[PDB]
Design a protein around this ligand. Sequence first.
Ligand SMILES: Cc1ncoc1-c1ccc(CNC(=O)[C@@H]2C[C@@H](O)CN2C(=O)CC(C)(C)C)cc1
Lengths: 103, 86, 141
Amino acid sequence: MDVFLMIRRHKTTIFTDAKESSTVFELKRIVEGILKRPPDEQRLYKDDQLLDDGKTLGECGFTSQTARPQAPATVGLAFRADDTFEALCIEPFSSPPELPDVM
Amino acid sequence: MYVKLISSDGHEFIVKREHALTSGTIKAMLSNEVNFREIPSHVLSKVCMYFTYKVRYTNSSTEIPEFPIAPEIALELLMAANFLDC
Amino acid sequence: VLRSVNSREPSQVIFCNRSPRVVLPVWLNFDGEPQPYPTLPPGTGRRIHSYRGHLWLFRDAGTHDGLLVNQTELFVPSLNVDGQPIFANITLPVYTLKERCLQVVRSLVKPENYRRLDIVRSLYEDLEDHPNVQKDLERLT
Ligand SMILES: Cc1ncoc1-c1ccc(CNC(=O)[C@@H]2C[C@@H](O)CN2C(=O)CC(C)(C)C)cc1
């Protein structure tokens, strides 16, 4: 079963899908192909929890019925700058304005 | 193969090239990053989710859910959808 | 041109609403006039008597947005094989993002107010140009 994800770091967001049965490490390989940083320089999170490399996405709570095409699940990403890892930081999206009177 | 779509407030959205070509306007802007000076990130994020939804449920007999749109973004999304022709 | 054929051959049909909308079934009578039939709530079904060669389409009862039936616009009952009814599976189409935004904006703004919106005149006309069965019969002809 496919799960639909937004992988997020700072002001970067990647839309991709993967299998419920695929591993955290396999998702780092996907990120590597896109942003050119190897798996050992990556940490992936679900909310504030660091995800272990050998776990499947399903085990980590990304399931086909919560990680949907029209409302994908967010995975946090942090990079290692040289020696140590930056902290997880996701810039929020902009805020919608007030509804006009007629709405 | 991926393309980068950048919102007016600087958010970078990375999506599959074939999903982005859902939009005739985006195909033309590529013919591979595109900047959108009028589309803020809270709108462009939803546009990218629509591409995923469209590709997933086009030509499929598995039941189709409603594409959700919050009232707060509906007006800006309409303007963006009109510009992008999708 | 788009009209039911007066075959007088019964055909039992199940209307199955697998949409999240309240569904209005429309029969095109023998002169092509649309005739509305009782609505179906979301997720519900009705067993109905129709006839071979009769033409049906399906709309959202509140807004008249277009729906699909067995993946197309029109449903024509066929011959029943071994007394089994024909299924008409009614579903949401994949709307374009523009049509879907117009639906939401129409559901929030009364038509008297479409002109107060800060948008291009062509979008004012798109809002006012409501979905409507007559307009789609002209289209499908
Ligand atoms: C209960 C219901 N909910 C949605 O639709 C119905 C419903 C209720 C009753 C019927 C009765 N059958 C008919 O009216 C058929 C359907 C269509 O083929 C036209 N028709 C006729 O019998 C020909 C007539 C209308 C008499 C010239 C059909 C559908």
